[PDB]
Amino acid sequence: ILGGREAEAHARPYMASVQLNGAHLCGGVLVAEQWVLSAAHCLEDAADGKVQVLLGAHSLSQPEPSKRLYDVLRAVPHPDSQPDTIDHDLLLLQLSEKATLGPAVRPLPWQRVDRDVAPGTLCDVAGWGIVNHAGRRPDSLQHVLLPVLDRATCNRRTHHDGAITERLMCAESNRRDSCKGDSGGPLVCGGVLEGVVTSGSRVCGNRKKPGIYTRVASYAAWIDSVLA
Ligand SMILES: NCc1cccc(NC(=O)c2cccc3[nH]c(C(N)=O)cc23)c1
């Protein structure tokens, strides 16, 4: 997160750190007792490495009673996702067993009504991604409140030039933004999961390149099929 602050420890119990060989790689969101939603581009070129999900965490390195690293039984990228596109950038990870729930580990209700979030709605995005242009990684969870950018402004030639489909949403990227290591994390609006961070457009903190988030309501049938 660029231009954010340190999050209140365990105040976002749905927050997951998706790891590869013991290192934070991507953000994630606990959507059911045994399922973590993330971005498909995260699993890209990971084929061989060990993927785990860390739940109940604030600090990536320090011991916390609620912290628990889970192994992954199944990694389910969206069938229509592809390395060279920003579309269908979703991944579902099935934990080895149901997560032990509590005040610091809880799934987040997610949006099932396929209608746009109002322009300007303030949404929360959290992550352990880079915090400056040099690439400094925070040990603890960061967050920023970002206003939703209307799709038409986002689709301007000066911005993402028609790449924002009805299945994608934007949020302002002026100084405050999600960045590398924040992909797969949640965009939460009015206490409900609305979007998943995509690294589709890679630049961070440039207002002419808004943040792109995959709309979970647009993939409601896919999420339900995988969990079934
Ligand atoms: N709000 C904009 C936003 C949100 C989330 C992530 C990103 N930017 C990246 O993730 C990124 C950046 C640079 C090199 C990179 N290399 C790779 C890689 N090999 O996976 C990713 C990146 C941008």
PDB file of C-alpha atoms in Angstrom, residues 41-210:
ATOM      1  CA  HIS A  41      -1.757 -13.861 -11.606  1.00  0.00           C
ATOM      2  CA  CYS A  42      -0.384 -14.681  -8.025  1.00  0.00           C
ATOM      3  CA  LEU A  43      -0.162 -18.428  -8.801  1.00  0.00           C
ATOM      4  CA  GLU A  44       1.610 -17.568 -12.110  1.00  0.00           C
ATOM      5  CA  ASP A  45       5.085 -19.195 -12.403  1.00  0.00           C
ATOM      6  CA  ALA A  46       4.607 -20.588  -8.831  1.00  0.00           C
ATOM      7  CA  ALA A  47       4.304 -24.149 -10.351  1.00  0.00           C
ATOM      8  CA  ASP A  48       6.634 -26.202  -8.017  1.00  0.00           C
ATOM      9  CA  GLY A  49       6.877 -23.788  -5.001  1.00  0.00           C
ATOM     10  CA  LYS A  50       4.956 -24.281  -1.770  1.00  0.00           C
ATOM     11  CA  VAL A  51       1.762 -22.143  -1.457  1.00  0.00           C
ATOM     12  CA  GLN A  52       0.385 -21.555   2.038  1.00  0.00           C
ATOM     13  CA  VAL A  53      -2.142 -19.122   3.526  1.00  0.00           C
ATOM     14  CA  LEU A  54      -1.413 -17.204   6.744  1.00  0.00           C
ATOM     15  CA  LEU A  55      -4.584 -16.230   8.679  1.00  0.00           C
ATOM     16  CA  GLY A  56      -5.055 -14.209  11.908  1.00  0.00           C
ATOM     17  CA  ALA A  57      -1.869 -12.174  11.243  1.00  0.00           C
ATOM     18  CA  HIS A  58      -0.868  -8.603  11.762  1.00  0.00           C
ATOM     19  CA  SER A  59       2.936  -9.058  11.710  1.00  0.00           C
ATOM     20  CA  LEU A  60       4.433 -11.447   9.052  1.00  0.00           C
ATOM     21  CA  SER A  61       7.447 -12.261  11.326  1.00  0.00           C
ATOM     22  CA  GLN A  62       6.376 -12.021  15.044  1.00  0.00           C
ATOM     23  CA  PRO A  63       4.372 -14.702  16.995  1.00  0.00           C
ATOM     24  CA  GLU A  64       0.701 -13.901  17.616  1.00  0.00           C
ATOM     25  CA  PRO A  65      -1.773 -16.301  19.325  1.00  0.00           C
ATOM     26  CA  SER A  66      -4.306 -16.031  16.440  1.00  0.00           C
ATOM     27  CA  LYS A  67      -1.640 -16.584  13.738  1.00  0.00           C
ATOM     28  CA  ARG A  68      -1.861 -19.884  11.836  1.00  0.00           C
ATOM     29  CA  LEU A  69      -0.205 -20.928   8.578  1.00  0.00           C
ATOM     30  CA  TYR A  70      -2.417 -23.272   6.497  1.00  0.00           C
ATOM     31  CA  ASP A  71      -1.381 -25.641   3.758  1.00  0.00           C
ATOM     32  CA  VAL A  72      -3.380 -25.639   0.493  1.00  0.00           C
ATOM     33  CA  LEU A  73      -5.312 -28.702  -0.735  1.00  0.00           C
ATOM     34  CA  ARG A  74      -6.346 -27.135  -4.068  1.00  0.00           C
ATOM     35  CA  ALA A  75      -5.441 -23.992  -6.093  1.00  0.00           C
ATOM     36  CA  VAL A  76      -8.291 -23.080  -8.445  1.00  0.00           C
ATOM     37  CA  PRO A  77      -7.512 -20.202 -10.860  1.00  0.00           C
ATOM     38  CA  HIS A  78     -10.477 -18.913 -12.945  1.00  0.00           C
ATOM     39  CA  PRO A  79     -10.593 -21.061 -16.147  1.00  0.00           C
ATOM     40  CA  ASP A  80     -10.735 -17.954 -18.391  1.00  0.00           C
ATOM     41  CA  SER A  81      -7.815 -16.086 -16.705  1.00  0.00           C
ATOM     42  CA  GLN A  82      -4.564 -15.684 -18.758  1.00  0.00           C
ATOM     43  CA  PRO A  83      -1.071 -14.300 -18.065  1.00  0.00           C
ATOM     44  CA  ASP A  84      -1.267 -11.490 -20.646  1.00  0.00           C
ATOM     45  CA  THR A  85      -4.801 -10.176 -19.730  1.00  0.00           C
ATOM     46  CA  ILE A  86      -6.411  -8.296 -16.760  1.00  0.00           C
ATOM     47  CA  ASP A  87      -9.680 -10.284 -17.132  1.00  0.00           C
ATOM     48  CA  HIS A  88     -11.130 -13.007 -14.818  1.00  0.00           C
ATOM     49  CA  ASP A  89      -8.155 -12.522 -12.489  1.00  0.00           C
ATOM     50  CA  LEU A  90      -9.494 -14.678  -9.648  1.00  0.00           C
ATOM     51  CA  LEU A  91      -8.095 -17.621  -7.687  1.00  0.00           C
ATOM     52  CA  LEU A  92      -9.670 -19.782  -5.059  1.00  0.00           C
ATOM     53  CA  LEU A  93      -7.525 -21.636  -2.532  1.00  0.00           C
ATOM     54  CA  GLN A  94      -8.886 -24.500  -0.532  1.00  0.00           C
ATOM     55  CA  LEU A  95      -7.193 -24.817   2.839  1.00  0.00           C
ATOM     56  CA  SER A  96      -6.072 -28.304   4.023  1.00  0.00           C
ATOM     57  CA  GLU A  97      -8.836 -28.032   6.663  1.00  0.00           C
ATOM     58  CA  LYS A  98     -11.440 -25.530   7.816  1.00  0.00           C
ATOM     59  CA  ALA A  99      -9.869 -22.486   9.454  1.00  0.00           C
ATOM     60  CA  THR A 100     -10.103 -22.266  13.266  1.00  0.00           C
ATOM     61  CA  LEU A 101     -12.412 -19.211  13.574  1.00  0.00           C
ATOM     62  CA  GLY A 102     -12.447 -16.523  16.271  1.00  0.00           C
ATOM     63  CA  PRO A 103     -12.233 -12.723  16.877  1.00  0.00           C
ATOM     64  CA  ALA A 104      -9.071 -12.496  14.692  1.00  0.00           C
ATOM     65  CA  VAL A 105     -10.123 -15.057  11.934  1.00  0.00           C
ATOM     66  CA  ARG A 106     -13.513 -14.675  10.289  1.00  0.00           C
ATOM     67  CA  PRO A 107     -14.837 -14.881   6.675  1.00  0.00           C
ATOM     68  CA  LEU A 108     -16.127 -11.708   5.055  1.00  0.00           C
ATOM     69  CA  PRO A 109     -19.589 -11.610   3.517  1.00  0.00           C
ATOM     70  CA  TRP A 110     -19.174 -10.908  -0.161  1.00  0.00           C
ATOM     71  CA  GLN A 111     -21.306  -9.136  -2.689  1.00  0.00           C
ATOM     72  CA  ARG A 112     -23.837 -11.252  -4.648  1.00  0.00           C
ATOM     73  CA  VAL A 113     -25.939  -8.433  -6.215  1.00  0.00           C
ATOM     74  CA  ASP A 114     -24.408  -7.561  -9.610  1.00  0.00           C
ATOM     75  CA  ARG A 115     -24.912  -3.731  -9.553  1.00  0.00           C
ATOM     76  CA  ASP A 116     -22.171  -1.057  -9.409  1.00  0.00           C
ATOM     77  CA  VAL A 117     -20.889   0.503  -6.164  1.00  0.00           C
ATOM     78  CA  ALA A 118     -21.884   4.271  -6.158  1.00  0.00           C
ATOM     79  CA  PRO A 119     -19.118   6.653  -7.455  1.00  0.00           C
ATOM     80  CA  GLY A 120     -17.045   8.017  -4.584  1.00  0.00           C
ATOM     81  CA  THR A 121     -18.056   5.326  -2.002  1.00  0.00           C
ATOM     82  CA  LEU A 122     -15.043   5.085   0.371  1.00  0.00           C
ATOM     83  CA  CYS A 123     -13.607   1.546   0.246  1.00  0.00           C
ATOM     84  CA  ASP A 124     -10.924  -0.097   2.335  1.00  0.00           C
ATOM     85  CA  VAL A 125      -7.935  -1.993   0.849  1.00  0.00           C
ATOM     86  CA  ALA A 126      -5.324  -3.636   3.116  1.00  0.00           C
ATOM     87  CA  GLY A 127      -2.109  -5.519   2.377  1.00  0.00           C
ATOM     88  CA  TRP A 128       1.532  -6.289   3.021  1.00  0.00           C
ATOM     89  CA  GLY A 129       2.639  -4.992  -0.411  1.00  0.00           C
ATOM     90  CA  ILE A 130       5.410  -2.414  -1.049  1.00  0.00           C
ATOM     91  CA  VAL A 131       5.129   0.955   0.795  1.00  0.00           C
ATOM     92  CA  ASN A 132       7.442   3.220  -1.318  1.00  0.00           C
ATOM     93  CA  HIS A 133       9.086   3.509  -4.773  1.00  0.00           C
ATOM     94  CA  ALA A 134      12.263   1.738  -3.535  1.00  0.00           C
ATOM     95  CA  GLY A 135      10.123  -1.364  -2.779  1.00  0.00           C
ATOM     96  CA  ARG A 136      10.356  -1.435   1.023  1.00  0.00           C
ATOM     97  CA  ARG A 137       8.160  -4.260   2.409  1.00  0.00           C
ATOM     98  CA  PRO A 138       6.247  -3.655   5.672  1.00  0.00           C
ATOM     99  CA  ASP A 139       6.404  -6.292   8.423  1.00  0.00           C
ATOM    100  CA  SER A 140       2.813  -5.433   9.464  1.00  0.00           C
ATOM    101  CA  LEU A 141      -0.506  -4.986   7.725  1.00  0.00           C
ATOM    102  CA  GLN A 142      -1.128  -1.583   6.032  1.00  0.00           C
ATOM    103  CA  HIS A 143      -4.340  -0.078   4.736  1.00  0.00           C
ATOM    104  CA  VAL A 144      -5.789   2.918   2.870  1.00  0.00           C
ATOM    105  CA  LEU A 145      -9.355   4.202   2.288  1.00  0.00           C
ATOM    106  CA  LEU A 146      -9.902   4.829  -1.419  1.00  0.00           C
ATOM    107  CA  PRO A 147     -12.911   6.410  -3.174  1.00  0.00           C
ATOM    108  CA  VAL A 148     -14.507   4.404  -6.007  1.00  0.00           C
ATOM    109  CA  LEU A 149     -13.871   5.883  -9.486  1.00  0.00           C
ATOM    110  CA  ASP A 150     -16.790   5.703 -11.999  1.00  0.00           C
ATOM    111  CA  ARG A 151     -16.094   3.255 -14.922  1.00  0.00           C
ATOM    112  CA  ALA A 152     -16.540   5.891 -17.667  1.00  0.00           C
ATOM    113  CA  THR A 153     -13.743   8.220 -16.202  1.00  0.00           C
ATOM    114  CA  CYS A 154     -11.666   5.089 -15.654  1.00  0.00           C
ATOM    115  CA  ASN A 155     -12.205   4.073 -19.339  1.00  0.00           C
ATOM    116  CA  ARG A 156     -10.954   7.463 -20.729  1.00  0.00           C
ATOM    117  CA  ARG A 157      -8.055   7.455 -23.299  1.00  0.00           C
ATOM    118  CA  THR A 158      -5.905   9.348 -20.724  1.00  0.00           C
ATOM    119  CA  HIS A 159      -6.657   6.564 -18.143  1.00  0.00           C
ATOM    120  CA  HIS A 160      -7.222   2.784 -18.934  1.00  0.00           C
ATOM    121  CA  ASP A 161      -8.565   3.513 -22.492  1.00  0.00           C
ATOM    122  CA  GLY A 162     -11.657   1.168 -22.696  1.00  0.00           C
ATOM    123  CA  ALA A 163     -10.045  -1.778 -20.788  1.00  0.00           C
ATOM    124  CA  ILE A 164     -12.519  -1.525 -17.824  1.00  0.00           C
ATOM    125  CA  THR A 165     -15.274  -4.077 -18.497  1.00  0.00           C
ATOM    126  CA  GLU A 166     -18.559  -4.401 -16.549  1.00  0.00           C
ATOM    127  CA  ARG A 167     -16.767  -7.153 -14.500  1.00  0.00           C
ATOM    128  CA  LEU A 168     -14.059  -4.689 -13.293  1.00  0.00           C
ATOM    129  CA  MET A 169     -14.153  -1.610 -11.023  1.00  0.00           C
ATOM    130  CA  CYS A 170     -11.800   1.353 -10.304  1.00  0.00           C
ATOM    131  CA  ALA A 171     -10.686   3.310  -7.277  1.00  0.00           C
ATOM    132  CA  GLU A 172      -8.571   6.484  -7.138  1.00  0.00           C
ATOM    133  CA  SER A 173      -4.816   5.935  -7.329  1.00  0.00           C
ATOM    134  CA  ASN A 174      -3.710   9.546  -6.503  1.00  0.00           C
ATOM    135  CA  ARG A 175      -0.675   9.116  -4.163  1.00  0.00           C
ATOM    136  CA  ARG A 176      -2.679   6.500  -2.158  1.00  0.00           C
ATOM    137  CA  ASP A 177      -2.799   3.095  -3.863  1.00  0.00           C
ATOM    138  CA  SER A 178      -2.424  -0.682  -3.735  1.00  0.00           C
ATOM    139  CA  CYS A 179       0.911  -1.847  -5.196  1.00  0.00           C
ATOM    140  CA  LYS A 180       3.123  -4.953  -5.753  1.00  0.00           C
ATOM    141  CA  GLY A 181       2.362  -7.567  -3.046  1.00  0.00           C
ATOM    142  CA  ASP A 182      -1.165  -6.174  -2.567  1.00  0.00           C
ATOM    143  CA  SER A 183      -2.622  -8.118  -5.553  1.00  0.00           C
ATOM    144  CA  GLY A 184      -5.361 -10.609  -4.539  1.00  0.00           C
ATOM    145  CA  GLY A 185      -6.349  -8.528  -1.510  1.00  0.00           C
ATOM    146  CA  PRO A 186      -9.853  -7.268  -0.671  1.00  0.00           C
ATOM    147  CA  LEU A 187     -11.613  -3.977  -1.618  1.00  0.00           C
ATOM    148  CA  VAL A 188     -14.271  -3.716   1.139  1.00  0.00           C
ATOM    149  CA  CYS A 189     -17.152  -1.226   0.765  1.00  0.00           C
ATOM    150  CA  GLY A 190     -19.756  -0.847   3.509  1.00  0.00           C
ATOM    151  CA  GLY A 191     -18.466  -3.949   5.318  1.00  0.00           C
ATOM    152  CA  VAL A 192     -18.957  -6.239   2.285  1.00  0.00           C
ATOM    153  CA  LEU A 193     -16.286  -7.596  -0.099  1.00  0.00           C
ATOM    154  CA  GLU A 194     -16.780  -5.769  -3.431  1.00  0.00           C
ATOM    155  CA  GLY A 195     -13.522  -6.345  -5.289  1.00  0.00           C
ATOM    156  CA  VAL A 196     -10.201  -8.189  -5.500  1.00  0.00           C
ATOM    157  CA  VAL A 197      -7.011  -6.267  -6.279  1.00  0.00           C
ATOM    158  CA  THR A 198      -5.604  -7.035  -9.712  1.00  0.00           C
ATOM    159  CA  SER A 199      -1.914  -6.353 -10.812  1.00  0.00           C
ATOM    160  CA  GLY A 200      -3.281  -6.060 -14.400  1.00  0.00           C
ATOM    161  CA  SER A 201      -2.042  -2.444 -14.689  1.00  0.00           C
ATOM    162  CA  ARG A 202       1.209  -2.511 -12.634  1.00  0.00           C
ATOM    163  CA  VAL A 203       2.026   1.203 -11.986  1.00  0.00           C
ATOM    164  CA  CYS A 204       1.368   2.441  -8.378  1.00  0.00           C
ATOM    165  CA  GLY A 205       0.411   5.957  -7.200  1.00  0.00           C
ATOM    166  CA  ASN A 206      -0.245   7.497 -10.671  1.00  0.00           C
ATOM    167  CA  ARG A 207      -3.724   9.239 -10.708  1.00  0.00           C
ATOM    168  CA  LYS A 208      -3.928   8.758 -14.515  1.00  0.00           C
ATOM    169  CA  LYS A 209      -3.736   4.948 -13.973  1.00  0.00           C
ATOM    170  CA  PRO A 210      -6.513   4.147 -11.400  1.00  0.00           C
TER     171      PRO A 210
END
